Amino acid sequence: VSVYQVSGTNVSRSLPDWIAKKRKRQLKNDLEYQNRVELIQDFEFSEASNKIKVSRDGQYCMATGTYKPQIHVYDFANLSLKFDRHTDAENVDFTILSDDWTKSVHLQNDRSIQFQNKGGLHYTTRIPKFGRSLVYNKVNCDLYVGASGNELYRLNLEKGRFLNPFKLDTEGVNHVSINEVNGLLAAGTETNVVEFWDPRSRSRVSKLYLENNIDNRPFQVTTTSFRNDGLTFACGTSNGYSYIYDLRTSEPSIIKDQGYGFDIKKIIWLDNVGTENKIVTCDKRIAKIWDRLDGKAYASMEPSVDINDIEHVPGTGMFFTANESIPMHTYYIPSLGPSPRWCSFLDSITEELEEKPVYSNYRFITRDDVKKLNLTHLVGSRVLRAYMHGFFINTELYDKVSLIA
Amino acid sequence: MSELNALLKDINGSLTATSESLERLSGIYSNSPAEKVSLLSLKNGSMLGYINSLLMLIGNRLDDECKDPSAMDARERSIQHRVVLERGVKPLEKKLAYQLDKLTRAYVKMEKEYK
């Protein structure tokens, strides 16, 4: 499958970007600068982005930056930066309440929640303990904020009052998500357990203990998401393993390994685009697209810089990935679906795109792990192939060896 | 240290390890009315015959006199049990694999509920 990178940094991983701007004045002559194409103007923070989401209309895109902590709100219709508003601290999460960009909620890193209207900051409230994630249940008009403390704080926008918090067995909430069809509020705690809560009642419908046979190292859940069908569920472990649980049965349907040993920063259920049985997993370095039923990889988008967050424009092939670099990368996988409306002529110019192309297929093992697994004798064999400081191995062979150890 | 001395010692410890594991095996069996599946049982009975043939071949290899050095009798018996596992028992297990796994799955579920 072909993956085209429309907007992004084109320099190598080793050479950092700020030099590119320094080189750029020296590279004005080169024809590539004139021919290089960017869809959205100024689609870049000064130093880095954190989280990027698209509005329900599909007309507006929103983002957050490192320094100064800014909030860009891009307008697709004008392919431009509609406005940038500063804040008092960095953003851990945000949700666009209204259909448009007009109304939003931000959980900053100072234990504060900020409500921003069109004009500017509307009201600020401070939760009792540090926040880590945020979700809005539209039906009940309740805002659920994960917290480092045991209490899962619940805030009601309609009545404008904190309500009684939901007490959780363990202390720590890395991520929260709500099933749209049902309303299950799955809280991902630091221990290998997800506490599923009925919103209408105040109860614990069940707790799900995740299990990883391959590794005995304890792990933390980092992301949870529900499919739009309403019955399937996802998880991401701190060891780099993503699960798909069918809620009715406790056992995992599939255990796919990204392979780089890096946490799973976000999971997107690609139901709308077409061929509904696709799930995207994102890591620090790589994001892979693989089928939910069979586990065979479809296509992978590897930028040369760390990925902070990824998001999918609904019903299209556009993939926005918030990175740790000045530009915010954009990815277009034509196979999945059509290009969005606002990029009408993106298809025509597909040839000039980079068309970036092993690494997503196999698992990556460091030198230390090789000694732990006593795979030293295979060093130099066709089984293990090298890249930076570790070797690649087939996932099955790794699971074969790790269980042996 | 003579090459034979190393081999005797290597055989000596390996045999000793074989004793401890067998004693554990006998104890677990003695712990084990539950009805025992005939085909899978024959698989175990067949294989214990195979290990028995291997040992008696080793005994022929330990024997200094070496009367029947090629060890046809021990070798023939190893064939006899080997064919049963590879050709007779194995195809039946695959055809019976689904129902066997289902029955085992039922028990582990019930044991979880009891726990």
């Binding site: 000064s46 130093e47 880095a48 320094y67 960095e90 760390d306 | -």
Partner: protein, 170 residues
């Protein structure tokens, strides 16, 4: 938006003072610089007067000084271990002054073999804990600079009762 004016606070008696005047430029503050481990990434800040302040948004190398031996070497910063003000800076691996980090010991190890010719002996003797850390491969160091002001992550290796107290806290 950030301000340092003391007018907004309550008086010592507890009265609620009225908003005296609008915010003035000579009493400003700027957003904090959450330095995190990674590729070096700094941007200048034009401050009052012609002076400039460097904001270390990202950094992965720093000069660290062995004070007992009085030497200094440039080393990579492995990760934050314990931070006295707030713990959640440890969880996100944020760098600020007084944060305790783990630094690669390889340059110090090479220098020590060079200077003392040992992996004369009495001088070569060093605290047991520091030798154990050298065996481990990472050294506990305290950052002395202010990454949010000077753009540097300079610091020094923990030794003696410093090391004892912080090891107890860990």
């Amino acid at each position: 938006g950030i301000s340092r004016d003391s007018r907004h606070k309550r008086s010592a008696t507890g009265a609620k003072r009225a908003q005296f005047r609008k915010k003035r430029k000579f009493e400003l503050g700027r957003q904090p610089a959450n330095t995190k481990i990674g590729a070096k990434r700094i941007h200048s800040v034009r401050t009052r007067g012609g002076n400039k302040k460097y904001r270390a948004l990202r950094i992965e190398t720093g000069n660290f000084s062995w004070a007992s031996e009085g030497i200094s070497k440039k080393t990579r910063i492995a990760g934050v271990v314990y931070h006295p003000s707030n713990n959640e800076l440890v969880r996100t691996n944020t760098l600020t002054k007084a944060a305790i980090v783990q630094i690669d010991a390889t340059p110090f190890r090479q220098w020590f073999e060079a200077h003392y010719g040992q992996t004369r002996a009495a001088s070569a003797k060093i605290e047991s804990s520091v030798e154990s850390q050298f065996s481990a491969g990472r050294l506990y160091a305290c950052i002395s600079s202010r990454p949010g002001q000077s753009g540097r992550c300079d610091g020094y290796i923990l030794e003696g009762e410093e090391l004892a107290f912080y090891l107890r806290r860990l």
